[PDB]
Design an enzyme around this catalytic site. Structure first.
Site, short mmCIF file in Angstrom:
data_model
loop_
_atom_site.label_atom_id
_atom_site.label_comp_id
_atom_site.label_asym_id
_atom_site.label_seq_id
_atom_site.Cartn_x
_atom_site.Cartn_y
_atom_site.Cartn_z
N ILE G 82 0.86 -1.18 0.00
CA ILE G 82 0.00 0.00 0.00
C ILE G 82 0.89 1.23 0.00
O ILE G 82 1.81 1.33 0.82
CB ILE G 82 -0.95 0.01 1.21
CG1 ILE G 82 -1.78 -1.26 1.23
CG2 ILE G 82 -1.86 1.21 1.14
CD1 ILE G 82 -2.52 -1.48 2.51
N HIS G 88 9.00 5.19 -1.23
CA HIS G 88 9.45 3.84 -0.91
C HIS G 88 8.62 2.78 -1.62
O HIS G 88 9.14 1.72 -2.00
CB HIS G 88 9.38 3.65 0.61
CG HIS G 88 9.92 2.34 1.08
ND1 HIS G 88 11.26 2.03 1.05
CD2 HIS G 88 9.30 1.27 1.63
CE1 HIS G 88 11.44 0.82 1.54
NE2 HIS G 88 10.27 0.34 1.90
#
Lengths: 154, 154, 154, 154, 154, 154, 154
Positions: G82, G88
């Site tokens: 998610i 990242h």
């Protein structure tokens, strides 16, 4: 011309009442109204059968059990439905009404529809004892009148 | 090609009328229209059976009792429904119409739908004697025509 | 794999048509289309039974009478409903469609739904001979195809 | 605790498929998906009966004919409905679904609902082979699973 | 008054179909519809000649070759044109239609115009199997009717 | 069913190309594409006749001269039209297309339309070698396919 | 033409599942779906090897260990990513997908990508059991089909 109509006297009539438990606070007022109507129109309280069911969904199946008893003249269905956030309200109210109507036609016995279907809680409060009069009383009157009518009509 | 159609003569036909008591002021006009239609198309008033029921909810169950009498040729259902604040109107009108239709198919007998379903009181006033003509008269015509039709068709 | 499908030839098939009288101007065009379809696909006009009913409400009960005749292969239901000011349109259309479907399932005989349900008169005019082709023709094609299909399927 | 559930193996099962002809371009993709599912889950194509009907309205009556054959284990109903300008879509879809459900309950046999009800053509294209997977495949899986389930459950 | 009209039976008629290859996905559906129409109206598939041409521009010249064969009763022209960014669409569609019409008048033989001329891809998808029915089927019906008509008219 | 279709092999075929001189920069690319197509599909360059004409207006009359030569199998018409300030573009493009189509029908020989009709120069650049592929190549493919088709069809 | 395709029967196949521990609540649903698919398509649960890894970053290196076992037919990679506040997410998802693909090409063994890459938690909830179906089930189907395919293809 032949006129068939029912008086509003409840002498000798036997009644069945199916009341849901959900919306406890208002269903109790509706049941009080129905019993008050039956008693004050000449009926005895010993001639009333009260069946309590968890929700409105089970009113048709309980009314099927009461209405097939021979010593019951009419059945009063009492419940309160208030619309929530989900469309659940529609699919419950439609099935309750449809089941009651189909049962009444099948058993050739008056099953009166005293169920409140309200969009808001405020409307349900109005229709259960406050400004608009309780549908318990209205349904009891309808049941008394049809019970008297079917005696002549049959 | 075989053509089956019903005349608009009411000689010798027997009719049943089920009229609710709610919306008393307009249901009376509808019943007047229906009786006027039957009489002025050649039918006798002694051949009409009138059944009074408390509300529209009980019209199907009373029509079930009239329509199974052998000496009834067609049944006219008369009632007035006006939409209120609650969705109660929908669940009453749907069940009344569905019960009448199912009954008509089951008993193989014409049951004519002369019930007014109005959003406002003003519309109901229009459709019960004023600018739009009363559905009592329209339903009586439909019942007469189907009663004549089924004599040939059966 | 077994494939069951009906040809579009109407030789030897017998048809029943139920047409309402309300919306006279458009129902006549629909009936013309249905008869034209049956005749031009090889069927004879002497093998068609036409039943006229006052309104759309009576189409199911008349179709019940035609569809139980042994010498009828399929039934075509023809009517025009245009939405008015009242919710009457909903409660009429729903009951007509429901009755036709229940009848078709009960009698194991194809009853084709050629009823126009229009919001406006302009749409009904489109769907009854003008830009969108008449549902009388479409319903006649459906009835012919199912009549041929059930000969193989039974 | 007793658990009843159906495997997804189609060995030895016999299937019936009812597919409408309207919306030809998409119903063909749905039928391809259903047959592919049955074949690739172990079933033979010689054990599939395909019935073609003109429109979605006739799917219930054709499924009534297939589902009463003893050598049919489940029935897959395939059709495409796209909403048009008239309320015709509502009265067709409601009757198709209601007839299929009533038939499935009556015949105690799984009749799977693989009918697309789309507001727009673009949605129907999505649900018939493109981004959302075809309901033909989904319905075939449901039918296989219920066919396996009822073998244990009966 | 003498009435000349063609039945919709395809027994004994021979057909020629010219289909372009551009817009492959939709022309295939149109050709499927045309063949289905011819077969299901009684014609044999062995009596159909199919000619594939690269684009719509060549449909007239290929139809000129088919239509002069003696054993061809009518010619069905099938193609899909979708408007692009350039006015090329206009100059292609006008010439295709003009050539087909001039050819039909010259050869005294029905050449039916089953070419889709769409502003957008979505319209072409509608008119080739989806909501609006495929012009392949419509053109096949027109060709069958004219083939039957000219037998009487000549 | 008889299927007539042309392969995409250019062995043994003789071609004629008519190319206008106006819009020199793009017509050269279109001609390069056409010759490349013919050569790389198996045809020889010694079997190609190239005719240069001043403008697009003269393409039909030059194609009339090439197409009546017996040793020419198909004719490829190549030109570029870009809309200017005056309506001259319309009256030139319409006549070029109409003349080519009439000539093709008259001489029973495929004359392929590889003329670019662009609203803007940028579109013409797209359609002549850049993002959209050159109509010279497309027209050469069409001519090859029709040349192969007419060998079977005649 | 030779057609190679895999059936959807899991008899005799051995599977390896690598599931990350991050997003514990949804990865558990994905693993449940994958095991349910394998079992209900005929596979045994004793033939499944489950490897739990801390995060999605380690799925490729664990799949490298499972996929080189001889008694493993296909590997199912299961994880939930998610998007957070930092980039990242991009650098993790890209490396996971790239490693899985490179591993699958290197080992000539199907490694199926059942990893959810969601912008929001609500999407991940949709794709892990709720409205959109779980990618665990989808990945298990893909792995079963490729395992069957490679038996024929090798």
């Amino acid at each position: 011309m032949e006129i068939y109509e029912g008086k509003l006297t409840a002498e000798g009539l036997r009644f069945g009442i199916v009341a849901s438990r959900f919306n406890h606070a208002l269903v109790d007022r509706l049941v009080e109204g129905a019993i008050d109507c039956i008693v004050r129109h000449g009926g005895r309280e010993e001639d009333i059968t009260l069946v309590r069911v968890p929700g409105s969904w089970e009113i048709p199946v309980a009314a099927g059990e009461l209405a097939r008893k021979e010593d019951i003249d009419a059945v009063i269905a009492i419940g309160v439905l208030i619309r929530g956030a989900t469309p659940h309200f529609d699919y419950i109210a439609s099935e309750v009404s449809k089941g009651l109507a189909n049962l009444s036609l099948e058993l050739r016995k008056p099953i009166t529809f005293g169920v409140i279907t309200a969009d808001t809680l405020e409307q349900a409060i109005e229709r259960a004892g406050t400004k608009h009069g309780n549908k318990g009383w209205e349904a009891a009157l309808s049941a008394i009148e049809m019970a008297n009518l079917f005696k002549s009509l049959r």
